[PDB]
Inverse folding.
């Protein structure tokens, strides 16, 4: 039933570069091979330090999941990268369509970490007459760094905002920058749609950069 | 472990009106009192029809959960309204934090149900110079019915979709017309959000500020 399948769509790390992000509760990595590794931490007085409590690896297309607890009861100490993957024993290998519900929260955490990185990864970059425009891989996040210094931000929750170089939210000059922002956004979206036509499995069309900073 | 918990926060039916969804495997209701009632169905040859196998009731702040399994094995005939049955024992009354994982699928299903309702419930309606914009209770589902006939939809689940005057989905924005629809989308969405934000200030427990409609059909 529609009740036995997780809420998020299967994640995927298309065009996302290696990155290692760390909160107080988790280390999360996108690896060179596109896989997502989540190392959830638990502080262990016994060792007086964070320990890797459990690990969730997710394939670059979101369909294959491995979830286990390393050395249960104590886990592993934190290193500069996630631990290597030991050959799976089977009962720690799940897939997207049958992932049990008790593991959905971890998977959703991965989807969200991937969402974040996608929201900061430029897919189309364009030099307008007024500023450097960047459409992110999410197709919704977008910003312009104006040569003057101002900045326009478009996000899925607030819409378009514009700021001065130090970050104060500016006002008829705003009407001008905002209008230019809409225009660039649409151009970048059109560039993106246009380029999918030339895309093949062997040859990519992104990330793309058009024009250059004037002088 | 913190990651070994239910995958949705507590639901809530704030400002949702009564409603009833029928799927092949459940009947889902939001009652007048704000309660969610999920009726799980299963076809039973012995009766030659679908029977209600079990039931899950969830309070309006998502904090109370009651699980029934009425007339076990046999179930109940489906009715057009959910009946408020006897609870076998106090063991069947849970709260959100202690709900056992064997019932998370049910709860999450309820929370999804509620999200569907919220995504179709207008919270801010604005009549612009170009269309009727509706920002929904989710704060992220947004649509404009342009007076000219175009339509623009915005959801977290599908990004942006824009339909020309002829009801055709646009694949790109080449003409001055399509580019103006996308632009109005952004401006009107920013405004409805600002309206939502500004109104909260006037909100109390005695008086509401939503749903709100600004202006009118030209």
């Amino acid at each position: 039933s529609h009740m036995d399948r997780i809420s998020v769509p299967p994640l995927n790390t298309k065009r996302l570069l290696p990155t290692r992000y760390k909160t107080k509760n988790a280390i999360m990595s996108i690896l060179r091979n596109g896989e997502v590794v989540l190392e959830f931490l638990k502080f262990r007085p016994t060792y007086n330090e964070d320990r890797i409590n459990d690990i969730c690896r997710i394939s670059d297309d979101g369909q294959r999941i491995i979830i286990y607890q390393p050395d249960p009861g104590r886990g592993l100490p934190v290193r500069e990268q996630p631990p290597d993957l030991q050959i799976p024993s089977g009962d720690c290998v799940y897939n997207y369509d049958n992932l049990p519900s008790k593991h959905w929260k971890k998977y959703i955490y991965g989807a969200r970490f991937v969402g974040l990185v996608k929201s900061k990864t430029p897919k189309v970059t364009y030099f307008s007459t007024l500023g450097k425009c960047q459409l992110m891989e999410t197709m919704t996040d977008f910003e312009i760094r104006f040569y003057s210094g101002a900045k326009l931000l478009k996000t899925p929750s607030e819409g378009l905002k514009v700021y001065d170089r130090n970050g104060m939210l500016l006002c008829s000059e705003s009407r001008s920058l905002i209008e230019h922002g809409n225009e660039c956004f649409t151009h970048c979206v059109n560039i993106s749609n246009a380029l999918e036509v030339a895309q093949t499995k062997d040859n990519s069309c992104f990330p793309v950069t058009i024009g250059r900073r004037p002088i």
About this structure: Chain A touches chain B at residues 1-4, 6-7, 25, 40, 42, 53-54, 101-102, 104-106, 108-109, 139-140, 154, 156-161, 178-179, 182-183, 185-186, 189-190, 193-194 (CB under 8 Å). DSSP finds two helices and 13 strands in chain A. The longest strand of chain A covers residues 49-58. The radius of gyration of chain A is 21 Å.
